[PDB]
Amino acid sequence: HHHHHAMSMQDTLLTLDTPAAVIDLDRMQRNIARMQQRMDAQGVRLRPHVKTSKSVPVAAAQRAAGASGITVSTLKEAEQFFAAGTTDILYAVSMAPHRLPQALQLRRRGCDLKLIVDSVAAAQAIAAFGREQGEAFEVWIEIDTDGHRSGVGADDTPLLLAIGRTLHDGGMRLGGVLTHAGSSYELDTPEALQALAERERAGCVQAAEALRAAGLPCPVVSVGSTPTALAASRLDGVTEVRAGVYVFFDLVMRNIGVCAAEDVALSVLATVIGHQADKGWAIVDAGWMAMSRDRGTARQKQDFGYGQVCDLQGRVMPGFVLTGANQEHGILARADGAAEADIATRFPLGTRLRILPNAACATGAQFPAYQALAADGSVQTWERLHGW
Amino acid sequence: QDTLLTLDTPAAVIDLDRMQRNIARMQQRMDAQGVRLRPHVKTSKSVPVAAAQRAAGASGITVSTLKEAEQFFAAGTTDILYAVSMAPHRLPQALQLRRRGCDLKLIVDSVAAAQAIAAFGREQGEAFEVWIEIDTDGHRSGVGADDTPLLLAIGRTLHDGGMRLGGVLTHAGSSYELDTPEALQALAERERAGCVQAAEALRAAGLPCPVVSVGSTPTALAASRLDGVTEVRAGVYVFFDLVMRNIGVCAAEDVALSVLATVIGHQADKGWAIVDAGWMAMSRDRGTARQKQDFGYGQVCDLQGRVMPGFVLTGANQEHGILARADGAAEADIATRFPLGTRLRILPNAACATGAQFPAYQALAADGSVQTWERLHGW
Numbered sequence A: 001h002h003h004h005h006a007m008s009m010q011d012t013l014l015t016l017d018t019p020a021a022v023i024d025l026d027r028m029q030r031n032i033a034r035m036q037q038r039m040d041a042q043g044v045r046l047r048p049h050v051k052t053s054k055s056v057p058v059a060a061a062q063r064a065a066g067a068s069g070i071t072v073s074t075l076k077e078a079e080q081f082f083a084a085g086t087t088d089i090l091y092a093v094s095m096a097p098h099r100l101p102q103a104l105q106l107r108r109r110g111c112d113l114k115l116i117v118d119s120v121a122a123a124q125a126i127a128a129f130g131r132e133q134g135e136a137f138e139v140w141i142e143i144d145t146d147g148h149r150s151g152v153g154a155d156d157t158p159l160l161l162a163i164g165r166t167l168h169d170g171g172m173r174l175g176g177v178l179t180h181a182g183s184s185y186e187l188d189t190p191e192a193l194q195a196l197a198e199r200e201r202a203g204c205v206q207a208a209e210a211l212r213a214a215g216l217p218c219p220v221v222s223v224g225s226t227p228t229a230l231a232a233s234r235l236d237g238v239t240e241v242r243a244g245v246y247v248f249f250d251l252v253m254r255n256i257g258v259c260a261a262e263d264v265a266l267s268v269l270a271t272v273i274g275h276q277a278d279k280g281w282a283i284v285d286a287g288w289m290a291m292s293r294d295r296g297t298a299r300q301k302q303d304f305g306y307g308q309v310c311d312l313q314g315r316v317m318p319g320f321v322l323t324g325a326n327q328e329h330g331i332l333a334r335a336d337g338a339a340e341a342d343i344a345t346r347f348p349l350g351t352r353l354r355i356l357p358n359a360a361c362a363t364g365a366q367f368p369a370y371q372a373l374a375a376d377g378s379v380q381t382w383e384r385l386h387g388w
Numbered sequence B: 001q002d003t004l005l006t007l008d009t010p011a012a013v014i015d016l017d018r019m020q021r022n023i024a025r026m027q028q029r030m031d032a033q034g035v036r037l038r039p040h041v042k043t044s045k046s047v048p049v050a051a052a053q054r055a056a057g058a059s060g061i062t063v064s065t066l067k068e069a070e071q072f073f074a075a076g077t078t079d080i081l082y083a084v085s086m087a088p089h090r091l092p093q094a095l096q097l098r099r100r101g102c103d104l105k106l107i108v109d110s111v112a113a114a115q116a117i118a119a120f121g122r123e124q125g126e127a128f129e130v131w132i133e134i135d136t137d138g139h140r141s142g143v144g145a146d147d148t149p150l151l152l153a154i155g156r157t158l159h160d161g162g163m164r165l166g167g168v169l170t171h172a173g174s175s176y177e178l179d180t181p182e183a184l185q186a187l188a189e190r191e192r193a194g195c196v197q198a199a200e201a202l203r204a205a206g207l208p209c210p211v212v213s214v215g216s217t218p219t220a221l222a223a224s225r226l227d228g229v230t231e232v233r234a235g236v237y238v239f240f241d242l243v244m245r246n247i248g249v250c251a252a253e254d255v256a257l258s259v260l261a262t263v264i265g266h267q268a269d270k271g272w273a274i275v276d277a278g279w280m281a282m283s284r285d286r287g288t289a290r291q292k293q294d295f296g297y298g299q300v301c302d303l304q305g306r307v308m309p310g311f312v313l314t315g316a317n318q319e320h321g322i323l324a325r326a327d328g329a330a331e332a333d334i335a336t337r338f339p340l341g342t343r344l345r346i347l348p349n350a351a352c353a354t355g356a357q358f359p360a361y362q363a364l365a366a367d368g369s370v371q372t373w374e375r376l377h378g379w
């Protein structure tokens, strides 16, 4: 009854509508194990950044493999994962004072939500609101270890101490420091990545040691980007590493050199809807609205256009990429710029293909849900969050 | 009331007075040319935005996915053109829409797609309406404007197959690479001429071709005449954006969509203010990078919507935007100018891409109040 109805209802890659975001669950599990084993080898916790998937069943797999808590990039993510049972949540974006009532309400409901700041003004806002509301917020100080984005300079002891004392004197819980070495995205050699992972570790530990030297607590030291989590040779002084895009990987990571195209677990299922035979084009229904506008591979060692073409079995078809994209139309052609002869027999109308993305975080956000592909060929819909 | 001070950020704000001026401008131009306007709702995917275009005199809509056809049909719109080469596997979905009472039109540019439609139509008892897409500028899909044998083959497949051959359409998307009035005008003419040529060639062989449909926002606004055309399709004009501004068909002040963002910190050394509108809010669209003025991830405006030339988002990560001087200098005391919590509005490179990042717009009225207007995501 339940059985017979569910079979006659269950989808495969041939029955799905296109475009669709497909997770190869076997590749996803191998990626989750690889990262968790590496952090276990290092004796550090893994606090996965769920911004890559924003999907409960994906985070559940990461927790099942040994992850401790999660990092989120929005309070919407904190709300969704808290409602799904995660209590240990780091909101790793410089806290806006106007979001303080939502952060308070989450903590009041039982979410052990941590906030981050990098300025004396944001620390004063949190501490003043905490005092007025009788709430000892936990706050960590964000450190700039590579010049990329937010944070207090690791060697700026006077600002570190001013922010740490503002929090501690004001009765908040100064819980740690964190950094994200996002400049790792510019590198493409194991040497350079190892040296940057060492700078990220050294600088975040240096900031923790300056706070402690002044008598302030700083029990957590949190570092990480996917490339540096995979390349660090040593993590002395670090308590946890944050990494997110690893769960799926993507062609940017492939080009950085921390994975192979065959480790990429996310692909976009697409149908061939036409051709321009004289130009060697196949037109597919995955345009930039499916792939996203991310072109992070354009300035790396191999430009994959709007994505690398794979056959329906997920095997790369070398030399064919989406060379261009409009909103709902992707232009499939030879990467080397030749006109494929007979493109229409190589890619007949109605043929389905799988496109590996430049950037899994940007492609995944284009979809309300993923289709999680099991080894038997069946798919299940895994919702993910959109918006704020 | 909800207002720009009480909204969480980032938020996609439509300035309704600007939107309405854009709606009126395009409709008035299409009336002056004697053609119907069939707005492309892929820019907003929002019922009340399309409702405002229809109230101004629009005739039917164009959609980029059947999910939009479902949404707008469920909202009472029946005259729907799905202007993406039809995939045969979507024929059961198109059929169910037509049987439910949606006057859904499909397009094709190949004999094989026409044969798949006609064979399915006959089997199911449905005379699908299908238009043939014409390639008038080499940009994307379509039958070559002087490829008569292909055009006819398709036309005969449809008409002789018992389908309704309803028209020809073209989209001169190469207009996006232009940035002068003379060039846009010449491309609009080449777009018109080639679409008409194709209609005349169908008619000369005894085949029906009652609709001749052309358009992109730039060519709709540049075309000097539209003889032989029955309708124009345009979509991004409803809000405009910086790519359109650089093409030359609008001013930055006409852009009706902005992203409301909060300053969450600084890098005072480098003269940066960090905002909570990163590329997840703006999208990764960098269409202005290849134009004559690059606006990074968007042009900064103050909370009142006044443009602040010279400040743009020079960089963006997923949830962090880097606001800094376009001239590359380090603004001195950027923190004193934009203290923590300051709200700003960012104009997008591409309104279609930026709007897709949000589950809804915040529609801003003259009294400063906002109403949330949901829009569609996905397929």
Ligand SMILES: Cc1ncc(COP(=O)(O)O)c(CN[C@H](C(=O)O)[C@@H](O)C(=O)O)c1O
Residues within 6 Å of the ligand: A049, A071, A092, A179, A180, A182, A185, A224, A225, A226, A227, A242, A243, A244, A245, A246, A361, B317, B318, B319, B320
């Ligand atoms: C604060 C913080 N922690 C960890 C991570 C995860 O790094 P990846 O696994 O390398 O993604 C990030 C991720 N942030 C950036 C982004 O903001 O876009 C990164 O994903 C990128 O694409 O540059 C983070 O912010």
Ligand SMILES: Cc1ncc(COP(=O)(O)O)c(CN[C@H](C(=O)O)[C@@H](O)C(=O)O)c1O
Residues within 6 Å of the ligand: A326, A327, A328, A329, B040, B062, B083, B170, B171, B173, B176, B215, B216, B217, B218, B233, B234, B235, B236, B237, B352
């Ligand atoms: C088939 C078709 N008709 C009309 C329009 C509307 O043109 P704009 O108003 O200029 O957007 C489009 C729009 N298509 C492209 C796109 O597919 O990305 C255009 O919006 C662009 O940014 O190039 C269309 O496809």
Ligand SMILES: [Mg+2]
Residues within 6 Å of the ligand: A245, A359, A361, B318
């Ligand atoms: Mg990323």
Ligand SMILES: [Mg+2]
Residues within 6 Å of the ligand: A327, B236, B350, B352
């Ligand atoms: Mg567009």
